[PDB]
Amino acid sequence: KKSTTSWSTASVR
Amino acid sequence: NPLTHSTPKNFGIGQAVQPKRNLSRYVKWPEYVRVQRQKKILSIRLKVPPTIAQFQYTLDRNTAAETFKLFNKYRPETAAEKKERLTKEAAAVSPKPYAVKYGLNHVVALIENKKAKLVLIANDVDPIELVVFLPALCKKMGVPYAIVKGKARLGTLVNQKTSAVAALTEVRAEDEAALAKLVSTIDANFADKYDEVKKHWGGGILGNKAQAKMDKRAKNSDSA
Amino acid sequence: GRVIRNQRKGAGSIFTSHTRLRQGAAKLRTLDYAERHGYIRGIVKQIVHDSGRGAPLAKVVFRDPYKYRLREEIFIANEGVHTGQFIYAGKKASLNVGNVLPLGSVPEGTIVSNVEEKPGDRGALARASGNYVIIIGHNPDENKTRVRLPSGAKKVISSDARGVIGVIAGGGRVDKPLLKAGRAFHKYRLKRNSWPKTRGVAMNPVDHPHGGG
Amino acid sequence: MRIKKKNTRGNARNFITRSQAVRKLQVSLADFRRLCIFKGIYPREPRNKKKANKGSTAPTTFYYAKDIQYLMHEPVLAKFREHKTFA
Amino acid sequence: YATVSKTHKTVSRAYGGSRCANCVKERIIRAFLIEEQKIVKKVVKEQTEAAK
RNA sequence: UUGACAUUGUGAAGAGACAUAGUUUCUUUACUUAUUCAAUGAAGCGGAGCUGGAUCCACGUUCUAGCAUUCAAGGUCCCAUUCGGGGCUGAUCCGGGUU
RNA sequence: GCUUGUGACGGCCCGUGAAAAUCCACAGGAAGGAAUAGUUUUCAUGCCAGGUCGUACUGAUAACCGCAGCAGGUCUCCAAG
RNA sequence: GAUGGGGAAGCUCCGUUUCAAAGGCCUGAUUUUAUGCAGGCCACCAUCGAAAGGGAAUCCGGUUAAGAUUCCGGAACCUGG
Ligand SMILES: [Mg+2]
Ligand SMILES: [Mg+2]
Ligand SMILES: [Mg+2]
Ligand SMILES: [Mg+2]
Ligand SMILES: [Mg+2]
Ligand SMILES: [Mg+2]
Ligand SMILES: [Mg+2]
Ligand SMILES: [Mg+2]
Ligand SMILES: [Mg+2]
Ligand SMILES: [Mg+2]
């Protein structure tokens, strides 16, 4: 759920 | 049209604001641009010794085009078709290759051993000491040479980005006559034509403003 | 020995100018195309007192020739300049008090002030109150002009150097006695820390070479 | 809390003009239009156009800023960059 | 001044607010008279150029 | 403070030596390209105009505490008329030097 | 009447007695906007929110410094008959 | 008092906008060469430095062993959306 890198997408529109 | 009128603008001194004009002459350029421009200008302004000034005399357009037309038929084998050739030899276990010779040390050795039929020397080589001795070596060894514009052009000849020198040593029987005719053409157009003028010092050119001042001073001296 | 005040003043420190209340450096316009070839008209908006300077200053507003805006300049006021006056600066300006003209465009005997030492430095000579420069003569072949300075010296300068017609306002200031250490104190409070002065003989030999006895 | 600046919140942040969207995506206008067509990004109209455009009444195409931010994560944009390199 | 209506910060006249009535009157007069004098000077100079 | 050497380049004129074909030393006088000083918003520099007026000038700004800003109005070629859109000019040309 | 704030003045200077954040106004008019419907959040009313740190007391012949609960030293406001 | 630069064997020094390619904004179906961004506008320098300078907006009543323009009751105002 939480980010690992500083730039993320995580795919929620 | 009664609704439109002519309203001329006075762009003289103490008048309406000046319009936008092309100010490219007054641009404060980046320092690297200024440095390369002033370096070229200084090379023009200074008196150039003959062994450097000889590199400003190159092959003309038509002769250079014919030379490169000959050499592109002997452009070397690329890495893609080398793998194809190496797989063909593995199944058998190949004819003799014909290619443009390149690489400065290799070409110098070929010239010293008198194997090079024709030598092409790029004029824009920095540092210039790498090729500044080549015309004299070719003349002493009796090898036909030609100074050409573009190490990038020679690089396209030899599948590289740049090339200081290219050399033709072995040619096919279908192109031996063309090579001989090209050698005679280069002898007529480059060796004989520029034999005297390559012995002179170059770069005796004044700037624009200094030239105008000298001409005005000469006119004032000769006529009142 | 020890360091005297003559040598201590060069370090700066407590000997720097007191410049809080100053109006700004008094200079001519930058020598641009308009002043090189024709003229330009500004307007005197106000005449103001400058702290630490005897002569009054004038605020003059010009129009920017390359952009729609106004440019403000601080001039040293010549005597007779008034608020609302039009001031003409350039090579084609007329010979009237307050106008800025090249030295080569004025006749002999012309009285100028705030004269450029070299063309472009925007005024260096005859700036104090009551002072002026006299145009002695011209040398057109060398494109030079001979002038007489307030000290009596004679100088040769470029004819493209500019000057303001007239004499600096506020003359006769030094003819009135101060009468009072307090008035001297208030005079130097707005200039710099160079007052009061102790005599070198009054000091000890370590403090000053003249000291002792 | 100190006084907040104007033209920073509300309609000023909700919408983004086309030029600003193109600059933020760092692509060309044609690529921007094709990406908007592919992803279904459509122009919108604020109820307070002067608030959205800092008092200007000039006609301007507005998009949702969060829609542009979501568009930033489309791999077709990376494919477009790869095609530019290949060309 | 940002809390009051525009009526409290202006008067119903050109340059209302920033400039007073007499200054506005004087600049109107000066503009008209100077433009008329400019027309007169243009006519006089244009005739003088041909007459010279 | 004075002198030598290096940084240090390019011409022309007059004198020296190969014994009256140009290889260098010594003076005189130029030049710019190194170096140095200053300024700017690196905006108008230098030359030329079968440019105009009378070798010189822009005849585009001087009674007045006004105004001067939206690729510039207009002229003239196109467009496909449609809310308008382009080109030359208005505002001469050339330069391998920001002044 | 005392204290204090404020106004219009007058005297003084070879002394003429801060900057910036910030707010408003004007000039200009790129533009946008109505007939069976528009415009105006600088008119009124209605909706929501406002983080972090400090905050006790002394301020002195005993809460500060002077080795002390030291006749010393230490900035300022209010002020009755 | 950094950066850009320049000094100094070096710890570091000068200097504070210069000597720097020091960054923001607008328009676009750019007469399309077909899946590669075109045309323009405006410009000067980090940061720190005042609990007496500048500065958005709050009052009264009550309440504690010790809080108070901060709590409670009532009545306001400012800023942003
Ligand atoms: Mg003594
Ligand atoms: Mg308390
Ligand atoms: Mg207390
Ligand atoms: Mg103690
Ligand atoms: Mg102690
Ligand atoms: Mg420092
Ligand atoms: Mg601070
Ligand atoms: Mg305070
Ligand atoms: Mg208490
Ligand atoms: Mg409460």
PDB file of C-alpha atoms in Angstrom, chain D residues 37-70:
ATOM      1  CA  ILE D  37      -8.211  11.674 -26.652  1.00  0.00           C
ATOM      2  CA  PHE D  38      -6.788   8.290 -25.616  1.00  0.00           C
ATOM      3  CA  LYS D  39      -7.373   8.807 -21.888  1.00  0.00           C
ATOM      4  CA  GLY D  40     -10.697  10.649 -22.126  1.00  0.00           C
ATOM      5  CA  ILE D  41      -9.471  13.983 -20.751  1.00  0.00           C
ATOM      6  CA  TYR D  42     -12.029  16.636 -21.657  1.00  0.00           C
ATOM      7  CA  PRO D  43     -12.072  20.430 -21.241  1.00  0.00           C
ATOM      8  CA  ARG D  44     -14.063  21.866 -18.346  1.00  0.00           C
ATOM      9  CA  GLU D  45     -15.670  25.190 -17.423  1.00  0.00           C
ATOM     10  CA  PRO D  46     -15.191  26.908 -14.051  1.00  0.00           C
ATOM     11  CA  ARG D  47     -18.176  28.752 -12.647  1.00  0.00           C
ATOM     12  CA  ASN D  48     -15.798  31.650 -11.827  1.00  0.00           C
ATOM     13  CA  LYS D  49     -13.600  32.175 -14.885  1.00  0.00           C
ATOM     14  CA  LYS D  50     -11.931  35.325 -13.541  1.00  0.00           C
ATOM     15  CA  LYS D  51     -11.021  33.494 -10.323  1.00  0.00           C
ATOM     16  CA  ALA D  52      -9.704  30.575 -12.375  1.00  0.00           C
ATOM     17  CA  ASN D  53      -7.655  32.799 -14.715  1.00  0.00           C
ATOM     18  CA  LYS D  54      -6.508  35.664 -12.430  1.00  0.00           C
ATOM     19  CA  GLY D  55      -9.076  38.193 -13.630  1.00  0.00           C
ATOM     20  CA  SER D  56      -8.668  37.652 -17.373  1.00  0.00           C
ATOM     21  CA  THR D  57     -11.817  37.283 -19.455  1.00  0.00           C
ATOM     22  CA  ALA D  58      -9.926  35.901 -22.454  1.00  0.00           C
ATOM     23  CA  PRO D  59     -11.168  32.524 -23.757  1.00  0.00           C
ATOM     24  CA  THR D  60      -9.118  29.687 -22.278  1.00  0.00           C
ATOM     25  CA  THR D  61      -9.431  25.900 -22.291  1.00  0.00           C
ATOM     26  CA  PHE D  62      -9.336  24.444 -18.774  1.00  0.00           C
ATOM     27  CA  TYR D  63      -8.695  20.896 -17.585  1.00  0.00           C
ATOM     28  CA  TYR D  64      -8.860  19.268 -14.181  1.00  0.00           C
ATOM     29  CA  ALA D  65      -5.443  19.469 -12.529  1.00  0.00           C
ATOM     30  CA  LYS D  66      -5.861  16.033 -10.950  1.00  0.00           C
ATOM     31  CA  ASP D  67      -6.793  14.651 -14.379  1.00  0.00           C
ATOM     32  CA  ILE D  68      -3.508  16.023 -15.748  1.00  0.00           C
ATOM     33  CA  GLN D  69      -1.645  14.564 -12.759  1.00  0.00           C
ATOM     34  CA  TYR D  70      -3.189  11.150 -13.438  1.00  0.00           C
TER      35      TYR D  70
END
